[PDB]
Amino acid sequence: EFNSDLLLAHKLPETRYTYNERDVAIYALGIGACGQDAVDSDELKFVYHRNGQDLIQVLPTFASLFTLGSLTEGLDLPGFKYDPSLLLHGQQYIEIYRPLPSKASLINKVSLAGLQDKGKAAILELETRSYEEGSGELLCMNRTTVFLRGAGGFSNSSQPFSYKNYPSNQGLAVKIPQRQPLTVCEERTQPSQALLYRLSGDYNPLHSDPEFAKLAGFPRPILHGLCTLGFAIKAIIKCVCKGDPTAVKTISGRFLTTVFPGETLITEMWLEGLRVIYQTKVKERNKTVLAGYVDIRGLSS
Amino acid sequence: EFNSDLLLAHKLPETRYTYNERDVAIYALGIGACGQDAVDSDELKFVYHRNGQDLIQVLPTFASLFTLGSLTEGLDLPGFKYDPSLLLHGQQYIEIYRPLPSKASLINKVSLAGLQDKGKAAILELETRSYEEGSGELLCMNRTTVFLRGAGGFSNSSQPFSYKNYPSNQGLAVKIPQRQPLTVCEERTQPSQALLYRLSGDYNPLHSDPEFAKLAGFPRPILHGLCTLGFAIKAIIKCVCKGDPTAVKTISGRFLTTVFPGETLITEMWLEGLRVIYQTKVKERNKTVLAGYVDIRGLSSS
């Protein structure tokens, strides 16, 4: 019952998403803004402004909230079924075309960017393009890569189905350079980090419910992968971009191991031209949990 | 009078662009579609269709017409002046997000993507984002890179101004692999190629007027670089993409040497994953005129 033509021709429905400056600030606190210093000049601008909360600046990983809903709700594709509870989020890819406003109404155009038959699992890549309702301008684009356990085996083993409808270098794993890191930044997450971060939209019991997380194989609920990503990109903004969030042009994050709220995240950064290569480790268990890159603006001044 | 902040905050006005299926076919003929064979199944679909001309397919380099006008008129940027006649077109970069329709009404939002003080010249990069009027969807994006002779020295030479507002890997020069090419395709351009291609929009006398071209430093009028680019990308569509223009997702082309209408273009191609690395030479003078890459769709069922 799987036909590739029908699936490639299928059109996924568009979405609306609305947010305001209070949503922006709750997100920023959810990913640790001013977590260590209330008067941190670099990070205070993400949660407060003397002339009104509408003037706070948006952290670029906020754009990841614009995808929420599709994959875990269901998302019916012609000739391709999967179990959403065994879904794993493999990587996130974000491109920021314009600085994100502190409030907006978005229209999200969604499209199937990739599908691979991997034997027992399938890899699915969904693209969300977020247009601002007033201007009509494209603010950003997200590509979400999920590992759909149990969803494989829908095509012929002689030629497994592989589909990539985007430039293949985007989100490619980049090797960690052999030299010492340019800058290392360390930040502790709060014991309640997941309970606060989930108020930005992702209410998955896996990050809040002890019993549910035990049944998933974890001794306590685990921090959202996208929260970890927010911490890392925040660190890059602080330690490489001189505090300016609008320096961030692309974000690639590959998720590796689980993080538990209350642990300390260490982000190591290298600079390769105008690409920041980075890696984030949990200090306590000394495990790498996140890796990727950030393309940044070049400006001599 | 040059301030970096004032320039970065400056917003360029948007433009409208309209085309139909006749514009598409004239373009396709302008970059050599069916140049060698009228009944070529691979290329006839770019200029004719059994069920009406509106069902012809659009060659992706057609999107380069959506930029025309900007740099050549003048385009005033705060604190930065330049002479548009001393403009040289260094590279083109195109991203195709959806296959281009055979007729459209576009809104082009334009923005300053890059500016460099290179001593006596400046490098300027303009981005055009083309939205379809009905859907509002972003069809494609162009980045045009021009070397503006005489425009340098606008910043303190003590710290030359460099500004790049896009992911720097896009359009990077990629090394030609040391192995032999996967595929080579060669096509003769027509002596009148530039006279036909300019009817798609670029009426610069440099490609049509013998006296004007001599005064620019050329023995005869030269073919538009974007015409050469059309030839290269068409060759890649036929020789790598099995004839499907919608396989093309990205186009980078760096212009290197002059081409004269009537010369024969040789395109060499290499495959590195889903990136085609390419190079175009003029057969007669054995000179490289164009180089870049094309990112293509991956689809196992093709």
Breaks in chain B after (C-N > 2.5 angstroms): none
- Measure Cα distances from A267 to A182, A187, A212 in Å: 11, 9, 29
Q: Is residue A3 located within the same domain as residue A37?
A: yes
B142 annotated ligand-binding residue: no
Q: DSSP for chain A, please give it.
A: ---HHHHHH--PPPEEEEE-HHHHHHHHHHTTTTSS-TT-HHHHTTT--TT-GGGPPPPGGGGGGGGTTHHHH---BTTB---GGGEEEEEEEEEESSPPPSSEEEEEEEEEEEEEEETTEEEEEEEEEEEETTT--EEEEEEEEEEETT----S-TTS--EEE-S-TTTT---PPPSS--SEEEEEEPPTTHHHHHGGGS---GGGT-HHHHHHTT-SS----HHHHHHHHHHHHHHHTSTT-GGGEEEEEEEE-S---TTPEEEEEEEEETTEEEEEEEETTTTEEEEEEEEEE-EE--
Count CB-CB contacts under 10 A for residue A180.
Answer: 8
Count of the separate structural domains present in chain A: 2
Rounded CA gap, B188 and B6, in Å?
A: 48
Query: Taking CB atoms and an 8 Å cutoff, what residues of chain B touch A169?
Result: 169, 275, 295
Q: Is residue A83 located within the same domain as residue A202?
A: no
B118 annotated ligand-binding residue: yes
Contact A137 B109 (CB under 8 A): yes
Q: CA torsion, points B211, B212, B214, B215, in degrees to nearest 10?
A: 120
Q: Is residue B59 located within the same domain as residue B84?
A: yes
Q: Which of A245, A198, A254, A298 is nearest to A96 (CA)?
A: A245
A207 included as an active-site residue:
yes
Q: Is residue A24 located within the same domain as residue A95?
A: yes
Count CB-CB contacts under 10 A for residue A51.
Answer: 6
Instruction: Kindly state the tokens that stand for B216.
Output: 């620019």
Contact A275 B250 (CB under 8 A): no
Answer whether B249 touches A (CB < 8 Å). yes
Of A112, A137, A172, which residue is a domain's last? A172
DSSP lists the bridge partners of residue B296 as B248
Q: Is residue B121 located within the same domain as residue B178?
A: no
Answer whether B302 touches A (CB < 8 Å). no
Residue of chain A with shortest Cα separation from B99: A165
For B263, phi then psi, to 5°, come to -80, 165
For residues A224 and A22, the answer to whether their CB atoms sit within 8 Å is no
Answer whether B118 touches A (CB < 8 Å). no
Residue of chain A with shortest Cα separation from B274: A168
Of A140, A172, A204, which residue is a domain's last? A172
A224 included as an active-site residue:
no
For residues A132 and A104, the answer to whether their CB atoms sit within 8 Å is yes
Q: Which of B123, B222, B266, B277 is the catalytic position?
A: B222
Instruction: Kindly state the tokens that stand for A257.
Output: 């191991």
For residues B88 and B254, the answer to whether their CB atoms sit within 8 Å is no
Query: Taking CB atoms and an 8 Å cutoff, what residues of chain A touch B301?
Result: 4, 159, 161, 163
Q: Any residues with CB less than 8 A from the CB of A188 and at least 6 apart, and which? A: A35, A36, A262, A263, A264, A265
Facing A162 at nearest CB: one of B169, B275, B300 = B300
For residues B139 and B130, the answer to whether their CB atoms sit within 8 Å is yes
Chain-centroid distance, C-alpha A294: 12
Facing B164 at nearest CB: one of A107, A129, A274 = A274
Answer whether A273 touches B (CB < 8 Å). yes
Q: Is residue B137 located within the same domain as residue B196?
A: no
Rounded CA gap, A254 and A290, in Å?
A: 6
Summarize the annotated binding site of A for substrate as residue ranges: 89-90, 118, 202-207, 225, 255
Q: Is residue A26 located within the same domain as residue A168?
A: yes
Query: Taking CB atoms and an 8 Å cutoff, what residues of chain A touch B250?
Result: 167
Q: Is residue A222 located within the same domain as residue A258?
A: yes
Q: Which of A23, A117, A201, A207 is the catalytic position?
A: A207
**At residue A154, what is the residue type?**
F
For residues A257 and A280, the answer to whether their CB atoms sit within 8 Å is no
Q: Which of B71, B214, B224, B206 is nearest to B151 (CA)?
A: B71
Query: Taking CB atoms and an 8 Å cutoff, what residues of chain A touch B163?
Result: 298-300
Query: Taking CB atoms and an 8 Å cutoff, what residues of chain B touch A275?
Result: 167-169
- Measure Cα distances from B216 to B145, B205, B254, B302 in Å: 20, 10, 20, 47
What is the experimental resolution, given in Å to one decimal place?
A: 2.6
Q: Is residue B168 located within the same domain as residue B267?
A: no
Q: Is residue A177 located within the same domain as residue A254?
A: yes
Q: Which of B87, B106, B122, B97 is nearest to B216 (CA)?
A: B87
Per-residue three-class SS string for chain B: CCCHHHHHHCCCCCEEEEECHHHHHHHHHHCCCCCCCCCCHHHHCCCCCCCCHHHCCCCHHHHHHHHCCHHHHCCCECCECCCHHHEEEEEEEEEECCCCCCCEEEEEEEEEEEEEEECCEEEEEEEEEEEECCCCCEEEEEEEEEEECCCCCCCCCCCCCEEECCCCCCCCCCCCCCCCCCEEEEEECCCCHHHHHHHHCCCCHHHCCHHHHHHCCCCCCCCCHHHHHHHHHHHHHHHCCCCCHHHEEEEEEEECCCCCCCCEEEEEEEEECCEEEEEEEECCCCEEEEEEEEEECEECCC
- Count of alpha carbons within 13 Å of A277, Cβ hemisphere only? 15
- Measure Cα distances from B257 to A74, A174, A181, B214, B275 in Å: 54, 34, 42, 16, 24
Matching residue, tokens 């195709």: B96
Length, in residues, of chain A:
301
Q: Which of B177, B175, B294 is nearest to B230 (CA)?
A: B294
Min distance A265 CA to chain B CA atoms (Å): 27
Answer whether B76 touches A (CB < 8 Å). no
Chain-centroid distance, C-alpha B293: 12
CB burial string A228-259: b at 16+ within 10 A, e below:
bbbbbbbbbbbbbbebbbbbbbbbbbbbbebb
Answer whether A295 touches B (CB < 8 Å). yes
Q: Any residues with CB less than 8 A from the CB of A193 and at least 6 apart, and which? A: A30, A32, A223, A227, A261, A262
Q: Which of B98, B145, B248 is nearest to A167 (CA)?
A: B248
Rounded CA gap, B287 and B264, in Å?
A: 11
Min distance A299 CA to chain B CA atoms (Å): 5
A37 included as an active-site residue:
no
Of B120, B143, B172, which residue is a domain's last? B172
Q: Is residue B7 located within the same domain as residue B116?
A: yes
CB burial string A10-20: b at 16+ within 10 A, e below:
eebeebebebe
Answer whether A161 touches B (CB < 8 Å). yes
Q: Is residue A104 located within the same domain as residue A6?
A: yes
Answer whether A158 touches B (CB < 8 Å). no
- Kindly tell me the sign of the dihedral angle through the C-alpha atoms of B242, B302, A112, B105: positive
Q: Which domain range does residue A282 map to?
A: 173-301
Rounded CA gap, B126 and B67, in Å?
A: 9
B69 included as an active-site residue:
no
